[PDB]
Amino acid sequence: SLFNVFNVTGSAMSAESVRLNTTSSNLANADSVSSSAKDTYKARHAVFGAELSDTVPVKVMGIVESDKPLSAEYNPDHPLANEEGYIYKPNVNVMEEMANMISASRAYQTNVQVADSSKQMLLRTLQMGQ
Amino acid sequence: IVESDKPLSAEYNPDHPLANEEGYIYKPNVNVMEEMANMISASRAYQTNVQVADSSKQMLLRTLQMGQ
Amino acid sequence: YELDYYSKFGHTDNYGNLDLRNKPYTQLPSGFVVKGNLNISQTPIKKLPKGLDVGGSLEATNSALKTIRSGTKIKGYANLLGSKIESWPRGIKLGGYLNLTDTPLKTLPAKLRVKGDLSVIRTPISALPEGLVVDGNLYIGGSALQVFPDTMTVKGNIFLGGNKITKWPSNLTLGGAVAP
Amino acid sequence: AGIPGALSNQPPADASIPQDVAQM
Amino acid sequence: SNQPPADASIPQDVAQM
Amino acid sequence: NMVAGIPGALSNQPPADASIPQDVAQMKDGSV
Amino acid sequence: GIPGALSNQPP
Amino acid sequence: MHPALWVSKTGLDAQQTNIATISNNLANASTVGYKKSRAVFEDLFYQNINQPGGQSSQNTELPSGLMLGAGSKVVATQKVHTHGNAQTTTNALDMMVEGDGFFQVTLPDGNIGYTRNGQFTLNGEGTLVTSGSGYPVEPEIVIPEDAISITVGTDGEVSVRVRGQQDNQVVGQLTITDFVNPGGLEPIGQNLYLPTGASGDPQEGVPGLDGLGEIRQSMLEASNVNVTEELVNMIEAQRVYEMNSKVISSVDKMMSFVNQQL
């Protein structure tokens, strides 16, 4: 029904919000050599997935880390330097985060139009019978 | 429901763990412009039939007043 | 090919965790020592080197790992989800849980001790070893197990998950509850 | 299931299998 | 759920929680 | 019980950043 | 009563 | 994402790797025996859109045969093994190869490493080792403590001068390894290379016969990087980087107009 559109579009609104927050944590950790949890932060990605289970909502199935190797930088005098003297920094790519930032915002706003479009159809469907 | 025959949108990204040998991730063949047009066409056509159905009831109600 | 000393350096973080995800490495040098966690997920590695030492946890989810040789020291947990391991060797010093879900595992060492949780979910294992001791939660859901040994020890909850147990241990002390 | 390398939001404990992720 | 969800932990050292 | 605290920027911070006064952070659990 | 609240009256 | 956004992003990623490649070359502008690397660009896959499948030919010039590429990428950081200039130094242990050929050093893990840098020295035992990490140089050349001079011949024949004995005693002979494809060597830092499948099996021999280069004593090989080429490459790479940013901004503004006007 038209109410299923609200569930489908609403799921995308939450879905694009997850990717926006993941990108925000990527931009804020692009230069963080250290990290609690004994893990040099690596770029995270939200992998969307259609939950077919007509109406196909979108669900986040889990956040996946980047496969790119960490950026090694020779800083011998740093306390975190290894024997060779290289400290490692996250593999966050700025350009893809900016592209993800644009795409997530554009996709978020176009889901609002569909919810608005379905809202008007239900209101007119209610005016029938009056 | 029938799936579109448009080829999938290929993107070069040898970083996504779900990529392939050549670092390509295939994405759905969804065109935003055609989805916006369908949204406009579906909403307007849906509400047009509301008017016809609503006006059809009025004709039925007037028929009951025949001879009165 | 095989991982070298210089190739090892390019897959290590600041605190010393080796990341080999999707990397085309087939075998690791013997007497290998890792400062932190080890990740060999989705790797074509079929065998772990003898004398392997991991300062953190071993991650081999959805990998091709098949054989682990005895004497391996793992400080953290062992996660072999979706791998090709068929048997668990005797004498593995495991400092954490052992997750063997969705593996072709068939045999387990006798009187095995798991300092954390144990998973045999959806495994073709036919029977648990005698004298098994589990300090955490035991999940046997979807597996082929239907008879427990004479004596076993589980300090947490026991989850049947759907499989039918007919012969319960004679000597069993449970710190939690049993769930179907 | 789905993605093979999803993360876990629970703090590391090294003793409990994380059930947050779809561990199948 | 029938009980409030727990808060979020943001520690500067996970070993101390 | 009553739950309260400073909203906005100060609370949406990691606890290490001690912007929030100590007693106000206590209120964020429960009170009566 | 918020412990240590500012007041609205000349000190 | 609209495909135009990602096609432009590939150009930004490709030029980003180009800048990093250029930056390393200018960093090693004074490294002895260094070879400059260049980034090679190639176009990505071209896809038929207005066709359900890849129908061969069949009106490529018409709207049915429209093909859109997927962008560009850096395919390889090719090593250019051009011979560098000569650095005449007064040190008696730094040596240079004139032409094709590599010094062979013994790596700690057992295999031998190949270097073009000639800054060598001796360790406590008198063995000829590199002046960096101190790896021994193959073949082992031990210098007697009674030697008052060292002479390295044009074919690696090392001789020493002993007081009280005329004529110079021979203490060994150097060898240089050659490869069929020098660009297939894998750099591992420390001015070292390793043999790969793309390089070939090592070809050893006396330095001065069998087409090999000749050993020159008290010389070094300067890096072959062209600082002007890198600066010109930087200018082009920066401009291409900015142009692709405009396309991404252009696509976003067009997409903004759609859901705002409609």
Side-chain angles (χ1 to χ4, degrees):
Chain A
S1 306
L2 297 321
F3 287 90
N4 292 10
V5 171
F6 298 150
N7 307 345
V8 172
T9 54
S11 60
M13 302 267 290
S14 178
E16 306 295 338
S17 179
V18 177
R19 182 166 57 172
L20 183 79
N21 296 17
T22 304
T23 296
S24 300
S25 59
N26 290 343
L27 292 174
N29 304 325
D31 213 321
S32 68
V33 49
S34 177
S35 129
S36 78
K38 291 324 136 282
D39 289 308
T40 298
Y41 184 81
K42 303 182 65 179
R44 296 182 176 182
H45 308 296
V47 179
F48 292 164
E51 91 171 61
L52 316 197
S53 188
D54 31 322
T55 143
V56 185
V58 51
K59 63 167 183 176
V60 270
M61 308 179 295
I63 276 72
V64 187
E65 283 181 327
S66 172
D67 256 331
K68 300 299 296 183
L70 294 172
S71 179
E73 296 165 20
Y74 169 74
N75 205 334
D77 31 4
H78 198 276
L80 294 184
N82 45 15
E83 293 288 349
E84 312 88 30
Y86 299 85
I87 65 174
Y88 306 95
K89 278 179 171 55
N91 46 335
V92 176
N93 186 90
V94 166
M95 307 310 297
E96 71 177 6
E97 307 297 339
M98 305 302 299
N100 289 13
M101 178 198 307
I102 291 180
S103 173
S105 57
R106 296 279 118 251
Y108 180 91
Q109 299 184 20
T110 188
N111 283 121
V112 183
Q113 298 282 11
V114 191
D116 179 73
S117 297
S118 180
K119 179 216 306 298
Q120 299 175 348
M121 300 165 59
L122 284 174
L123 298 188
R124 230 300 157 185
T125 309
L126 283 171
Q127 290 174 57
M128 150 186 206
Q130 291 284 358
Chain B
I1 268 66
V2 175
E3 298 173 344
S4 176
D5 208 0
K6 185 72 62 183
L8 294 180
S9 176
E11 293 187 354
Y12 174 76
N13 197 15
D15 158 67
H16 204 260
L18 301 175
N20 70 332
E21 313 166 357
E22 312 181 40
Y24 281 94
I25 47 172
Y26 297 87
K27 308 206 81 67
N29 51 18
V30 175
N31 193 97
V32 174
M33 292 304 303
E34 77 182 13
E35 301 301 331
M36 300 297 298
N38 287 8
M39 182 206 313
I40 301 179
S41 183
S43 62
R44 298 267 68 258
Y46 176 88
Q47 301 176 35
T48 303
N49 292 117
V50 186
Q51 294 281 1
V52 183
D54 177 71
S55 300
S56 178
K57 179 185 180 182
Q58 298 179 1
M59 297 193 303
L60 289 179
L61 296 185
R62 300 311 283 259
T63 306
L64 302 178
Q65 244 57 66
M66 177 200 304
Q68 304 176 26
Chain C
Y1 63 107
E2 41 272 1
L3 184 75
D4 294 68
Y5 171 62
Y6 314 97
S7 296
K8 174 216 301 181
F9 133 92
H11 299 296
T12 301
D13 60 356
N14 292 303
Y15 297 158
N17 305 279
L18 187 60
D19 158 71
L20 303 179
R21 208 179 305 103
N22 283 263
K23 304 308 174 184
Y25 300 117
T26 59
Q27 59 182 12
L28 298 182
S30 63
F32 200 66
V33 174
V34 182
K35 186 174 186 177
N37 303 271
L38 177 53
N39 196 323
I40 51 178
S41 302
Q42 300 171 308
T43 53
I45 287 184
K46 286 186 174 182
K47 191 175 305 176
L48 281 180
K50 188 177 182 179
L52 175 68
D53 190 6
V54 177
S57 304
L58 175 63
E59 197 80 357
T61 52
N62 303 269
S63 62
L65 181 61
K66 176 187 179 181
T67 303
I68 298 183
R69 299 189 173 186
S70 59
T72 304
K73 296 184 176 183
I74 301 179
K75 175 184 172 183
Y77 57 82
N79 191 4
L80 310 179
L81 201 169
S83 56
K84 297 299 180 178
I85 169 183
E86 300 186 19
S87 61
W88 184 258
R90 173 195 171 184
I92 293 295
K93 299 184 180 182
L94 207 62
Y97 62 76
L98 182 56
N99 185 10
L100 302 173
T101 305
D102 293 320
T103 55
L105 171 85
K106 299 176 180 180
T107 62
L108 290 177
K111 303 179 182 180
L112 176 60
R113 265 197 52 89
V114 180
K115 300 181 182 180
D117 304 5
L118 184 64
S119 293
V120 293
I121 288 183
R122 276 161 278 183
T123 50
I125 177 186
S126 57
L128 281 177
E130 193 70 44
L132 183 66
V133 179
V134 182
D135 295 359
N137 302 14
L138 178 56
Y139 298 78
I140 67 175
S143 62
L145 302 176
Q146 289 211 3
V147 167
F148 282 168
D150 291 324
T151 303
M152 77 181 305
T153 300
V154 179
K155 295 185 178 181
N157 295 268
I158 296 181
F159 299 90
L160 300 184
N163 76 113
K164 314 300 173 58
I165 289 296
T166 59
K167 184 176 182 178
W168 288 79
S170 302
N171 174 32
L172 174 59
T173 302
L174 185 67
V178 182
Chain D
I3 52 189
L7 301 184
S8 176
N9 194 27
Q10 306 294 150
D14 306 1
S16 304
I17 35 184
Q19 223 65 29
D20 195 319
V21 68
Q23 212 188 197
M24 30 185 296
Chain E
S1 64
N2 65 280
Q3 296 192 20
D7 301 12
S9 299
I10 321 173
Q12 44 186 135
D13 194 68
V14 186
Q16 324 297 337
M17 287 181 56
Chain F
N1 48 12
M2 180 261 293
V3 72
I6 293 175
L10 284 213
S11 187
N12 290 79
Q13 296 276 1
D17 184 75
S19 306
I20 295 292
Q22 186 59 59
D23 299 73
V24 183
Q26 304 283 344
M27 310 185 56
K28 193 181 60 60
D29 272 357
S31 82
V32 53
Chain G
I2 40 162
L6 294 194
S7 58
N8 47 5
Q9 168 243 0
Chain H
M1 311 186 63
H2 192 268
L5 279 186
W6 199 261
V7 171
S8 302
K9 199 207 75 64
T10 55
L12 288 164
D13 201 337
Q15 297 297 334
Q16 168 184 311
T17 307
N18 191 26
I19 299 290
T21 302
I22 298 162
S23 185
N24 178 81
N25 292 16
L26 283 183
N28 298 270
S30 297
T31 311
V32 169
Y34 180 84
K35 301 308 176 183
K36 61 169 180 293
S37 303
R38 62 177 179 181
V40 184
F41 295 80
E42 91 181 352
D43 43 356
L44 292 170
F45 169 72
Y46 279 81
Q47 188 171 351
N48 297 265
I49 45 173
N50 296 332
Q51 293 279 6
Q55 274 71 284
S56 181
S57 302
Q58 291 184 209
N59 314 122
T60 61
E61 337 100 345
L62 298 193
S64 180
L66 180 57
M67 309 181 62
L68 300 190
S72 58
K73 71 171 187 175
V74 176
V75 343
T77 50
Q78 188 177 27
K79 280 284 186 179
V80 186
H81 294 252
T82 50
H83 203 283
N85 284 265
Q87 296 181 178
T88 299
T89 59
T90 182
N91 190 14
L93 273 308
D94 48 353
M95 45 197 62
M96 184 185 178
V97 175
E98 286 183 347
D100 36 321
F102 298 89
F103 293 102
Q104 38 177 312
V105 308
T106 301
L107 302 188
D109 50 327
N111 59 336
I112 57 179
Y114 308 95
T115 174
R116 203 69 192 278
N117 194 332
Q119 298 183 270
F120 299 141
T121 183
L122 313 179
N123 72 83
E125 303 119 19
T127 307
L128 179 65
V129 304
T130 55
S131 184
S133 301
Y135 301 154
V137 179
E138 280 279 2
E140 166 179 324
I141 304 299
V142 285
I143 296 304
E145 300 211 26
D146 316 327
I148 58 184
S149 90
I150 305 299
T151 303
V152 179
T154 186
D155 50 62
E157 185 138 339
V158 185
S159 301
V160 301
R161 178 67 172 177
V162 175
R163 192 106 300 180
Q165 167 187 155
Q166 67 171 117
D167 308 10
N168 286 258
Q169 177 190 352
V170 181
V171 297
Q173 182 163 354
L174 290 180
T175 56
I176 58 171
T177 293
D178 195 7
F179 298 98
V180 175
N181 178 253
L185 289 170
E186 167 199 5
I188 64 176
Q190 305 172 349
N191 295 135
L192 262 44
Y193 299 90
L194 279 187
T196 61
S199 181
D201 195 73
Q203 305 290 149
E204 64 282 0
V206 169
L209 52 85
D210 195 62
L212 293 178
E214 303 178 5
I215 302 299
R216 291 282 176 260
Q217 196 184 194
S218 67
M219 290 192 184
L220 287 178
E221 193 187 48
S223 61
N224 67 336
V225 301
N226 204 141
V227 293
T228 306
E229 286 192 358
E230 318 303 324
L231 294 184
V232 171
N233 290 11
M234 287 294 300
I235 293 180
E236 156 133 332
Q238 176 170 351
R239 291 294 160 261
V240 180
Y241 197 89
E242 298 175 352
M243 292 187 310
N244 293 266
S245 302
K246 305 226 302 299
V247 189
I248 284 188
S249 179
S250 296
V251 175
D252 170 58
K253 290 180 176 59
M254 292 173 63
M255 278 304 177
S256 179
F257 198 90
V258 177
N259 49 36
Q260 163 241 321
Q261 201 72 13
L262 265 53

